[PDB]
Symmetry: D3
Subunit: 133 residues, 6 copies
Amino acid sequence: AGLQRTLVLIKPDAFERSLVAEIMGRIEKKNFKIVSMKFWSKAPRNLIEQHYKEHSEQSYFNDNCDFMVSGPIISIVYEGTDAISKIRRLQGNILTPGTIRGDLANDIRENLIHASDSEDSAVDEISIWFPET
Amino acid sequence: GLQRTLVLIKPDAFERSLVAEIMGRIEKKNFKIVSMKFWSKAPRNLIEQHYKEHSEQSYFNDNCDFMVSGPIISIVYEGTDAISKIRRLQGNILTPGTIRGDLANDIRENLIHASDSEDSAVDEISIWFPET
Amino acid sequence: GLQRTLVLIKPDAFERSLVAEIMGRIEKKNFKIVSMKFWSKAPRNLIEQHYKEHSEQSYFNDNCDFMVSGPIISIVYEGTDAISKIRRLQGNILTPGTIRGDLANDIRENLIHASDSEDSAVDEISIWFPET
Amino acid sequence: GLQRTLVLIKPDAFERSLVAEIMGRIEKKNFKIVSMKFWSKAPRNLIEQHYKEHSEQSYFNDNCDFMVSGPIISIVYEGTDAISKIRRLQGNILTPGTIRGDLANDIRENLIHASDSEDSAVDEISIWFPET
Amino acid sequence: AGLQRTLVLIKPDAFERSLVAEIMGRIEKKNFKIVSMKFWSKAPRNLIEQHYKEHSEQSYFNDNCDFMVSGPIISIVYEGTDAISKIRRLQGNILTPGTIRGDLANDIRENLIHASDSEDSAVDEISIWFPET
Amino acid sequence: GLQRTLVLIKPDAFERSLVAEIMGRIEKKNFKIVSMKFWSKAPRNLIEQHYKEHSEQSYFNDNCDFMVSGPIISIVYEGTDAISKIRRLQGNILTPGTIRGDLANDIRENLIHASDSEDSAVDEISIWFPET
Ligand SMILES: Cc1cn([C@H]2C[C@H](O)[C@@H](COP(=O)(O)OP(=O)(O)O)O2)c(=O)[nH]c1=O
Ligand SMILES: Cc1cn([C@H]2C[C@H](O)[C@@H](COP(=O)(O)OP(=O)(O)O)O2)c(=O)[nH]c1=O
Ligand SMILES: Cc1cn([C@H]2C[C@H](O)[C@@H](COP(=O)(O)OP(=O)(O)O)O2)c(=O)[nH]c1=O
Ligand SMILES: Cc1cn([C@H]2C[C@H](O)[C@@H](COP(=O)(O)OP(=O)(O)O)O2)c(=O)[nH]c1=O
Ligand SMILES: Cc1cn([C@H]2C[C@H](O)[C@@H](COP(=O)(O)OP(=O)(O)O)O2)c(=O)[nH]c1=O
Ligand SMILES: Cc1cn([C@H]2C[C@H](O)[C@@H](COP(=O)(O)OP(=O)(O)O)O2)c(=O)[nH]c1=O
Ligand SMILES: [Mg+2]
Ligand SMILES: [Mg+2]
Ligand SMILES: [Mg+2]
Ligand SMILES: [Mg+2]
Ligand SMILES: [Mg+2]
Ligand SMILES: [Mg+2]
């Protein structure tokens, strides 16, 4: 059919603010299924830098890494019809009410969640967090 | 500009236990229930009539099969700008914040139907609530 | 031990926009809707019959007046241990966690009615859904 | 980045018991309460100053009467880009996902007020919290 | 009728954990109305000690005061039928799911909310937080 | 005061999409996730060890098959009095306010498992997280 898989990361601020179930629930209610899930008490900076390698040239690149390893994170692989962009739309941004970041986040860096933005990004990101491909 | 529109809560809503969730979103936008019917299984006739305008489409038959594969609730809602607002509340599976935007993810199994114009509203209401 | 019980959603539920909230609590406990009717204003006859056992009480007349001062929904729910469980779900205005425990605060305006025994269930269902 | 904006929870919010619901959406977006006051009935001169930029509109008088028809809560929220962000949260009755889009459906009884600019924010805050 | 007024205090841990609306919403949904409300960025230890004067002899008395002034608090006066005990039952304790403390709290001291436990306590507590009686 | 207990989110939880709902109730009670694992299908020997104290019961085999009929999540929660508190949160299908009381209605498909003692907690955690 139109089956797809995408990679989501629940960020440290999510645990800090007790919004983990809240975020996962929004994705769950949109009818997406967990295919793989891993809890990281503290992720290796290595994986983070690979995950954000495309951003290695930006000014915010190192502070973002500091943050991404400042607390726990959960890497999840969701599956569903048109999953990559639907979950991306669900993630939204801090300016659009109705989405996860729009309702719960308010910072350029501490935005609670990451979602693959394309097929190439997904395949690559999933490989990073679930090497046992 | 007070109006009345027709809403159908689809089988997938019962399957996934989202009936109250959906009705609650409409109720909280302050629209009232004027009439309502519960159908364990809707008569295929009614369904075909409801989607008459689609009889020529390729998705017609399967859609009917689905619309009868479970219970459905027919509801007539009243309120200011009801048709337009409930339609907007229904949304689509792309934009978060709406019923379909937050809970649906299929082009066919989209939980709810809402009239899209004054004309279809009057017609749809007559189909499910002939007693008028 | 599959059963069917009758539930009435009272006027105060429509007044306070808690209809979906209440139906959602029952739906989430996994009980299904077997039949349902919406009444803009319930016929006083039905109400008097429903509360027959109370005809001698001092609160009878006022209760009837209230039960007809707004819309009400009659619902027949099915499920394992339905009568007992939905009754427990209905609770009372003292114990938090139940429908009345979290949302009601009056001895008369308590949002919902649920049969309390196998006998009253069969009788109550016959009153609102004679077509049996 | 830090800003402070003034929000007013309107009479209809108390009537419909949506006060916690509204304040909750702002709290979940991570904004903090700096100041807050509950008015069982706000002094009319305060309301008129608050809407002074509207003093020549046809709806001015009626709106002020509505704002004085019940309690209201004035709150000073602090947070990054607070003015713009809380303004978008409020939205309008045509935008699902926002406060007015999900819970309001009237041109006047629209549950909430939020400053629309830095000047209006500064002016409005001094109106409800002159003690600074 | 059976009209009553009671005094509720939203505690510092409530703001810390962003549970203020949540708590007030549970009381709001049970059909109780706010008659007076005051926001304290930091309450004067004086009022706290008066509020808990009956506990002045307990070991936990000073730490509880330290906490009660460690952050903001909101004093509210609710009104409704049988308000004092109904709101008291709503408050519940950390061992009873279904109540505010039962669902959201988990400590002997940081328990999110205070509710008058009797008519005498209410009248006295209300006087403490709303002297303009 | 600090304890650590083992929780299992059962297959029915994924089937009924109640995973976030269940985990949310534990998260809102202030318990923290220490360890967590998702199993699309848990190895049967793990389930049998987990319920080894039940190995002689008539329901043993059927329960194990149910526990292997879908994904499950094993979590180690840490918090003050975690074992007892999370146990009460789980409750039973007769107790409104708890997880099973609000969402479950079966003797076997009861959505969640939580250690009932310090020894069982210690044993259970080593079964799902032997890497310690
Ligand atoms: C733009 C930006 C991003 N970041 C971090 C957090 C962002 O989620 C991450 C990726 O940036 P980006 O791709 O711009 O946003 P999204 O995550 O919405 O695609 O980099 C900052 O820390 N500061 C910034 O200014
Ligand atoms: C377009 C389309 C519709 N349908 C069914 C389900 C749609 O809800 C129903 C009506 O279609 P439509 O009128 O295009 O959308 P809405 O219901 O948003 O106005 O027809 C399909 O089964 N497959 C399709 O490709
Ligand atoms: C006891 C009582 C009941 N009533 C009305 C509303 C009650 O829901 C209805 C039925 O009473 P009852 O059977 O005692 O309670 P339940 O509905 O919990 O079984 O009668 C009053 O109006 N005043 C009263 O004092
Ligand atoms: C435009 C308009 C506003 N009002 C009232 C309610 C509006 O919230 C208030 C302020 O007007 P306005 O600034 O247009 O709306 P907002 O509050 O979205 O900026 O005036 C009316 O009563 N009638 C009207 O036609
Ligand atoms: C019993 C106790 C109370 N306290 C503080 C917080 C309690 O909410 C407050 C009042 O105690 P108490 O009357 O026992 O509980 P409640 O507040 O449920 O009536 O004193 C402690 O700090 N430690 C304790 O051991
Ligand atoms: C008692 C019982 C349990 N079970 C299954 C589901 C129970 O959750 C599991 C463990 O039994 P038990 O310890 O009695 O329940 P809990 O999980 O509340 O401690 O065994 C059955 O399938 N049939 C039964 O009759
Ligand atoms: Mg990106
Ligand atoms: Mg259409
Ligand atoms: Mg009775
Ligand atoms: Mg304005
Ligand atoms: Mg006390
Ligand atoms: Mg057990």
